[PDB]
Design a protein around this ligand. Structure first.
Ligand SMILES: Nc1nc2c(ncn2[C@@H]2O[C@H](COP(=O)(O)O)[C@@H](O)[C@H]2O)c(=O)[nH]1
Ligand code: SF4
Ligand SMILES: [Cl-]
Ligand SMILES: [Fe+3]
Length: 178
């Protein structure tokens, strides 16, 4: 009855932990470029985990791992919200479900469900598709409900947690400029 929860960023982790109790977290995001930004986001997650004694596992981040992600999304390099993001989130959640099976967790989820930008129907579709493939149950919750999003905002402010202004990939950084 344990869940492995992919973590995109510390602000969305803060929103999520208002609602989840006995979870292992999995910080895996080869979509975040460049390395300096990956490390800044990772350190914010580490700060939250130390503050609240969370159990966080950190996934692979390497030139090889980034190349695998880029292959998955390359054919739609379109805007945010399109087939490119469907491929990106499926890549992240596939790796998470793989890890969940390896570590004995019967369920998996993602803090992307707490992000106000993301498309919840798209994420739930991806999660349920991956559930069918790996036999790890996808746990869906609107993590922003119950006032948790605003609750994540005030914890982020009090803790001094880095709050990014682009989704993470190079494409989203360019779309930020335009
Ligand atoms: N700082 C912060 N970023 C978030 C949060 N939730 C999702 N994000 C990500 O940060 C990106 C910031 O993009 P923008 O704020 O320019 O729209 C979003 O598109 C999303 O991918 C959050 O709660 N706080
Ligand atoms: S905008 Fe976000 S979800 Fe879409 S491809 Fe880039 S990192 Fe992935
Ligand atoms: Cl995010
Ligand atoms: Fe996030």
């Amino acid at each position: 009855g344990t869940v492995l929860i992919h973590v995109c960023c510390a602000p969305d982790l803060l929103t999520t932990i208002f609602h989840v109790r006995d979870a292992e977290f999995f910080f895996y995001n080869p979509n975040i470029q460049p390395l300096s930004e990956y490390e800044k986001r990772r350190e914010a997650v580490d700060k939250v985990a130390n503050h609240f004694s969370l159990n966080v596992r950190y996934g692979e981040y390497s030139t090889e791992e980034i190349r695998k992600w880029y292959t998955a999304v390359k054919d739609y390099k379109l805007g945010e919200g399109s087939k490119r993001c469907e491929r990106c989130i499926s890549f992240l959640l596939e790796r998470t479900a793989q890890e969940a099976r390896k570590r004995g967790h019967e369920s998996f989820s993602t803090t992307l469900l707490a992000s106000p930008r993301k498309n919840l129907p798209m994420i739930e579709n991806i999660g349920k598709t991956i559930e069918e493939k790996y036999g790890v149950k996808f746990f869906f919750k609107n993590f922003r409900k119950g006032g948790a999003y605003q609750e994540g905002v005030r914890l982020s402010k009090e803790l001094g947690i880095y709050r990014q202004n682009y989704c993470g990939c190079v494409f989203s950084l360019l779309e930020r400029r335009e």
